[PDB]
Design an enzyme around this catalytic site. Structure first.
Site, mmCIF file in Angstrom:
data_model
loop_
_atom_site.group_PDB
_atom_site.id
_atom_site.type_symbol
_atom_site.label_atom_id
_atom_site.label_comp_id
_atom_site.label_asym_id
_atom_site.label_seq_id
_atom_site.Cartn_x
_atom_site.Cartn_y
_atom_site.Cartn_z
ATOM 1 N N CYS B 104 0.754 -1.232 -0.253
ATOM 2 C CA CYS B 104 0.204 0.416 0.156
ATOM 3 C C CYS B 104 0.247 1.073 0.569
ATOM 4 O O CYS B 104 1.784 1.719 1.533
ATOM 5 C CB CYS B 104 -0.835 0.196 1.262
ATOM 6 S SG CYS B 104 -2.402 1.708 0.563
ATOM 7 N N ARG B 107 -0.231 4.561 2.531
ATOM 8 C CA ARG B 107 0.050 4.535 4.094
ATOM 9 C C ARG B 107 0.528 5.889 5.023
ATOM 10 O O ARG B 107 0.509 5.612 6.439
ATOM 11 C CB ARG B 107 1.040 3.615 4.672
ATOM 12 C CG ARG B 107 0.818 2.130 4.513
ATOM 13 C CD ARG B 107 1.207 0.392 4.134
ATOM 14 N NE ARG B 107 2.477 0.454 3.456
ATOM 15 C CZ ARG B 107 3.366 -0.133 3.730
ATOM 16 N NH1 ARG B 107 4.182 -0.465 4.872
ATOM 17 N NH2 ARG B 107 4.498 0.067 2.731
ATOM 18 N N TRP B 276 -9.750 6.150 -1.312
ATOM 19 C CA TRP B 276 -9.771 6.456 -2.497
ATOM 20 C C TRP B 276 -8.743 6.438 -2.872
ATOM 21 O O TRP B 276 -7.503 5.175 -2.759
ATOM 22 C CB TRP B 276 -9.648 7.957 -1.953
ATOM 23 C CG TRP B 276 -8.794 8.387 -1.180
ATOM 24 C CD1 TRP B 276 -7.764 9.163 -1.832
ATOM 25 C CD2 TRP B 276 -8.154 8.974 0.299
ATOM 26 N NE1 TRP B 276 -6.199 9.466 -1.062
ATOM 27 C CE2 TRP B 276 -7.088 9.409 0.366
ATOM 28 C CE3 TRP B 276 -9.628 8.648 1.308
ATOM 29 C CZ2 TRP B 276 -6.579 9.595 1.122
ATOM 30 C CZ3 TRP B 276 -8.376 9.627 2.428
ATOM 31 C CH2 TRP B 276 -7.477 10.169 2.933
ATOM 32 N N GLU B 281 -4.394 3.663 -11.116
ATOM 33 C CA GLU B 281 -5.342 2.434 -11.030
ATOM 34 C C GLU B 281 -6.553 2.174 -11.719
ATOM 35 O O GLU B 281 -6.650 1.009 -12.489
ATOM 36 C CB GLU B 281 -5.657 1.965 -9.214
ATOM 37 C CG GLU B 281 -4.828 1.852 -8.682
ATOM 38 C CD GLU B 281 -4.100 0.427 -8.557
ATOM 39 O OE1 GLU B 281 -2.921 -0.800 -9.048
ATOM 40 O OE2 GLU B 281 -4.895 -0.736 -8.448
HETATM 41 C C1 HEM Z 1 -6.125 6.337 1.866
HETATM 42 C C2 HEM Z 1 -6.025 5.477 0.136
HETATM 43 C C3 HEM Z 1 -5.267 4.620 -0.332
HETATM 44 C C4 HEM Z 1 -4.579 4.812 -1.763
HETATM 45 C C5 HEM Z 1 -4.191 5.810 -2.413
HETATM 46 C C6 HEM Z 1 -3.898 3.942 -1.500
HETATM 47 C C7 HEM Z 1 -3.417 2.931 -2.317
HETATM 48 C C8 HEM Z 1 -3.352 1.499 -2.711
HETATM 49 C C9 HEM Z 1 -2.250 1.589 -3.767
HETATM 50 C C10 HEM Z 1 -1.853 1.799 -5.032
HETATM 51 C C11 HEM Z 1 -2.451 -0.248 -4.129
HETATM 52 C C12 HEM Z 1 -1.694 -1.444 -4.975
HETATM 53 C C13 HEM Z 1 -2.761 -1.237 -6.245
HETATM 54 C C14 HEM Z 1 -3.761 -2.151 -5.651
HETATM 55 O O1 HEM Z 1 -4.864 -2.009 -5.343
HETATM 56 O O2 HEM Z 1 -3.893 -3.432 -6.505
HETATM 57 C C15 HEM Z 1 -3.102 -0.375 -1.933
HETATM 58 C C16 HEM Z 1 -2.686 -1.619 -2.384
HETATM 59 C C17 HEM Z 1 -3.426 -1.600 -0.414
HETATM 60 N N1 HEM Z 1 -3.827 -0.963 -0.217
HETATM 61 FE FE1 HEM Z 1 -3.861 1.300 0.176
HETATM 62 N N2 HEM Z 1 -4.688 2.802 -0.311
HETATM 63 C C18 HEM Z 1 -5.509 3.609 0.383
HETATM 64 C C19 HEM Z 1 -5.816 3.601 1.433
HETATM 65 C C20 HEM Z 1 -6.067 1.998 2.219
HETATM 66 C C21 HEM Z 1 -7.120 1.084 3.200
HETATM 67 C C22 HEM Z 1 -7.569 2.132 4.060
HETATM 68 C C23 HEM Z 1 -5.954 0.542 3.887
HETATM 69 C C24 HEM Z 1 -7.146 -0.635 4.756
HETATM 70 C C25 HEM Z 1 -7.307 -0.136 5.901
HETATM 71 C C26 HEM Z 1 -5.688 -0.175 2.610
HETATM 72 C C27 HEM Z 1 -5.366 -1.655 2.152
HETATM 73 C C28 HEM Z 1 -4.198 -1.834 1.562
HETATM 74 C C29 HEM Z 1 -3.757 -2.651 1.632
HETATM 75 C C30 HEM Z 1 -3.612 -4.378 1.877
HETATM 76 C C31 HEM Z 1 -3.300 -3.440 -0.050
HETATM 77 C C32 HEM Z 1 -2.800 -4.312 -0.845
HETATM 78 C C33 HEM Z 1 -3.760 -4.888 -2.096
HETATM 79 C C34 HEM Z 1 -3.567 -6.548 -3.032
HETATM 80 O O3 HEM Z 1 -2.551 -7.008 -2.128
HETATM 81 O O4 HEM Z 1 -4.673 -6.809 -3.449
HETATM 82 N N3 HEM Z 1 -4.960 1.398 1.860
HETATM 83 N N4 HEM Z 1 -3.852 0.315 -1.756
HETATM 84 O O1 LIG Z 2 -6.333 -1.253 -1.005
HETATM 85 N N1 LIG Z 2 -8.075 -0.420 -1.534
HETATM 86 O O2 LIG Z 2 -8.682 -0.592 -0.650
HETATM 87 C C1 LIG Z 2 -6.856 0.803 -2.798
HETATM 88 C C2 LIG Z 2 -7.534 2.128 -2.123
HETATM 89 C C3 LIG Z 2 -6.911 3.530 -2.677
HETATM 90 C C4 LIG Z 2 -6.665 2.801 -3.945
HETATM 91 N N2 LIG Z 2 -6.027 3.551 -5.452
HETATM 92 N N3 LIG Z 2 -6.195 2.413 -6.386
HETATM 93 C C5 LIG Z 2 -5.922 1.184 -5.890
HETATM 94 C C6 LIG Z 2 -6.293 1.138 -4.524
HETATM 95 C C7 LIG Z 2 -6.701 0.409 -3.400
#
Ligand code: HEM
Ligand SMILES: O=[N+]([O-])c1ccc2[nH]ncc2c1
Ligand code: HEM
Ligand SMILES: O=[N+]([O-])c1ccc2[nH]ncc2c1
Ligand SMILES: [Zn+2]
Lengths: 400, 400
Positions: B104, B107, B276, B281
């Site tokens: 992620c 973070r 968000w 993506e």
């Molecule tokens: C606040 C805005 C956030 C942004 C911009 C963001 C962005 C991303 C991005 C670009 C990825 C990798 C690409 C994909 O989704 O396949 C990702 C993966 C991930 N995010 Fe974040 N994220 C956000 C919030 C969160 C939140 C709130 C959580 C959990 C409480 C979280 C948990 C994860 C996890 C566990 C992954 C790995 C997903 C996978 O392995 O397929 N994310 N996020």
């Molecule tokens: O993991 N998520 O919930 C999550 C949150 C925001 C994101 N932007 N682009 C991919 C993506 C995934």
């Protein structure tokens, strides 16, 4: 027990059975992955394995000649602590090293490699002659040919032959009084070393650096490549008329000269090799990295882009046109070059060829995927397995 | 020894001391790196460690309350084989799970996660109500708020709460008789499952799928999300007037719902979370992946680009404008969105914060670096260390 490798675009699955035969250990452990990081009996063991590879390649494994060769190598090591490779083995070993390079996307060409045997080299002057001949052959007036020149191997009673420069052709980097750098910032150290050794510098942004060549146990000697031997390409854009006015250019031949060639336990600290450029290395890395020429902002401003906000993607737009310019320019000057799409497509074919040939292929995903448009290329959606096989090209400490 | 981590743009060095606390093991070995691959007493040891983490976080480690809690948990496991988290611990655990996610890039906002306790959920209908409430709160008419809703934990002698859908909002994928797919090819399996369970399928490219919610020891129940709940964004371009006519759109809320939340040995199979979108993506992966909407060529043709040769970089140019369209459209619709430059820049700050806070940060380089313009972002030039810390979000098998 064999790593399952999946391609997420087409869904195809393969198993890497070759990884199980990795000769050396990497940086990773079950506790943490370090894949993103840039950097007696042992000799005999590697020697025997190499000889086995050689005889297997010529379909004569277990033959009398095979057993005889194994005995000779053993005899030489027992008497001298080292051994002499046969000409055919050197050629085979050099190709395998390229074949085994995990970070190389141009490996579909691994079998087409011209090997210059310079193991009889006796001085820095002779080393220079060998290098000039390599450059001339490899450049071939623009129709680049892959080549490697192998200098004498490391041995017990003397120092190593070394090429101080990182590549045979590199542009100088002059630190300015205001703190900035004129030329290639990546080359500030070697530039200053050349100056320290007697070279009166130029004052341009693209000054070809002299070669600092080292013969065993002697200080390095400076040699200037005749300009006629260094093929360069002026950069212009097909539609952006002002691009040509920027006065940018790059050299035709990418020739790495600071890596160590390892074959059957023997080490060749000086063995420069070359192929041809994949456009992104020039257009994206050399010209756009913030710590390199860093021309992104200037180009964007000239493109009349809005550099106030990141969301307009002015950086992405400028990078694309710079890459377009690199490709258009090399094609115009008739100098071999390959774009990232064509290169990655060819690598997928290489993976297929190697799966059939050896049941796997060591590949470093982070280095295989291009610096721009990663997911637009097939390699991005391809899982890979990274491991060390020998013969191999290895990094080594700078001679100073 | 502690892994030395270097940033190649600036030259700064740090040592990851946090990796030594990696509770679980990864797929890598000294023999080979698999970093690019997508996929009673033990409970107590995990429980104690988590409780210890919690008391350390409130600066009360070693207190009577800390000790009493450790004993309380041990007694509860001895009497029931499992234990229950206090609300304050659940909140802390969920936040740490996000903080620890190596893939992620968003973070830096980990501490602001809003955690909703839905452990009192009694049925699939109550689950649906909780999900709709999460969507309303999280969407917030475009001003997105990060949040997670935690449903009842897994326990012996009882089935699990599960959300069959991979995300709360997904577009249907209909396999046509001619072999093609109308809609999102990634959602073909879930679309067919929804149809099998009584859903009347549509025929559009952007049909919002119904929720297939599973309560303990019960068959999955179908639920339709009220349209007024699903905020969507029509895609248009700021200069390419014809872009809007393509009829492209995407939803505002990215809500992952198929991952398992692990806290102190306890497992929560149903705990949907949302944040968000980072523009790439949607613009690069969802719309441009060959196995997804695959609109690259169609857009390039409309842009009047030479699709005959790869060297014109028509793919790169089309991909850039699609990303521009996404950013422009979300900003116009006033829906939260972050471009890859801003996102990666904030991640570098997060790494800095974490180095000082915990002495490291588990990061997956291949996932952190954006699908387009990798080297144009700071994260590309940053070495990273990937490892598994707990609390954590883990992948789990599909319920079917
Ligand atoms: C606040 C805005 C956030 C942004 C911009 C963001 C962005 C991303 C991005 C670009 C990825 C990798 C690409 C994909 O989704 O396949 C990702 C993966 C991930 N995010 Fe974040 N994220 C956000 C919030 C969160 C939140 C709130 C959580 C959990 C409480 C979280 C948990 C994860 C996890 C566990 C992954 C790995 C997903 C996978 O392995 O397929 N994310 N996020
Ligand atoms: O993991 N998520 O919930 C999550 C949150 C925001 C994101 N932007 N682009 C991919 C993506 C995934
Ligand atoms: C023929 C055309 C070739 C192409 C298009 C090609 C392309 C590439 C690319 C894109 C990289 C990464 C470059 C970087 O990021 O610095 C690379 C690395 C490498 N290539 Fe190839 N290559 C070619 C020929 C060769 C040859 C002839 C050899 C050896 C005999 C070779 C050996 C290597 C090695 C050892 C690396 C890793 C360098 C490092 O780790 O810094 N390449 N090549
Ligand atoms: O490493 N190399 O010798 C080598 C060869 C060909 C290349 N094209 N673009 C970069 C590059 C590097
Ligand atoms: Zn690894």
């Amino acid at each position: 027990k064999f790593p399952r490798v999946k391609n997420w675009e087409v869904g195809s699955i393969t198993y890497d059975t070759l990884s199980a035969q990795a000769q050396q250990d990497g940086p990773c452990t079950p506790r943490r992955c370090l894949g993103s990081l840039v950097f007696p009996e042992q000799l005999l063991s590697q020697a025997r394995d190499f000889i086995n590879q050689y005889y297997s390649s010529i379909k004569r494994s277990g033959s009398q000649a095979h057993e005889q060769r194994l005995q000779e190598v053993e005899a030489e090591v027992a008497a001298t602590g080292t051994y002499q490779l046969r000409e055919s083995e050197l050629v085979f070993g050099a190709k395998q090293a390229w074949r085994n390079a995990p970070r190389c996307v141009g490996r579909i060409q691994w079998g087409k490699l011209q090997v210059f045997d310079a193991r009889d080299c006796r001085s820095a002057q002779e080393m220079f002659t060998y290098i000039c001949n390599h450059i001339k052959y490899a450049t071939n007036r623009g129709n680049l040919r892959s080549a490697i020149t192998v200098f004498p191997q490391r041995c017990p009673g003397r120092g190593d032959f070394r090429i101080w420069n990182s590549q045979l052709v590199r542009y100088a980097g002059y630190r300015q009084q205001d703190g900035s750098v004129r030329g290639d910032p990546a080359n500030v150290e070697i530039t200053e070393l050349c100056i320290q050794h007697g070279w009166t510098p130029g004052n341009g942004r693209f000054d070809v650096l002299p070669l600092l060549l080292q013969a065993p146990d002697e200080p390095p000697e400076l040699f200037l490549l005749p300009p006629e031997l260094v093929l360069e390409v002026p950069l212009e854009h097909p539609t952006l008329e002002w691009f040509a006015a920027l006065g940018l250019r790059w050299y035709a031949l990418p020739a790495v000269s600071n890596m160590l060639l390892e074959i059957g336990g023997l080490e060749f600290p000086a063995a420069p090799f070359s192929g041809w450029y994949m456009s992104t290395e020039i257009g994206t890395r050399n010209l756009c990295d913030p710590h390199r020429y860093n021309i992104l902002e200037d180009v964007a401003v000239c493109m009349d882009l809005d550099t106030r906000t990141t969301s307009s993607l002015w950086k992405d737009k400028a990078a694309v046109e710079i890459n377009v310019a690199v490709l258009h320019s090399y094609q115009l000057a008739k100098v071999t070059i390959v774009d990232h799409h064509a290169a990655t497509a060819s690598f997928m074919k290489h993976l297929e060829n190697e799966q059939k040939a050896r049941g796997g292929c060591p590949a470093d995903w982070a280095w295989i995927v291009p610096p721009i448009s990663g997911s637009l290329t097939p390699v991005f959606h391809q899982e890979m397995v990274n491991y060390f096989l020998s013969p191999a090209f290895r990094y080594q400490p700078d001679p100073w």
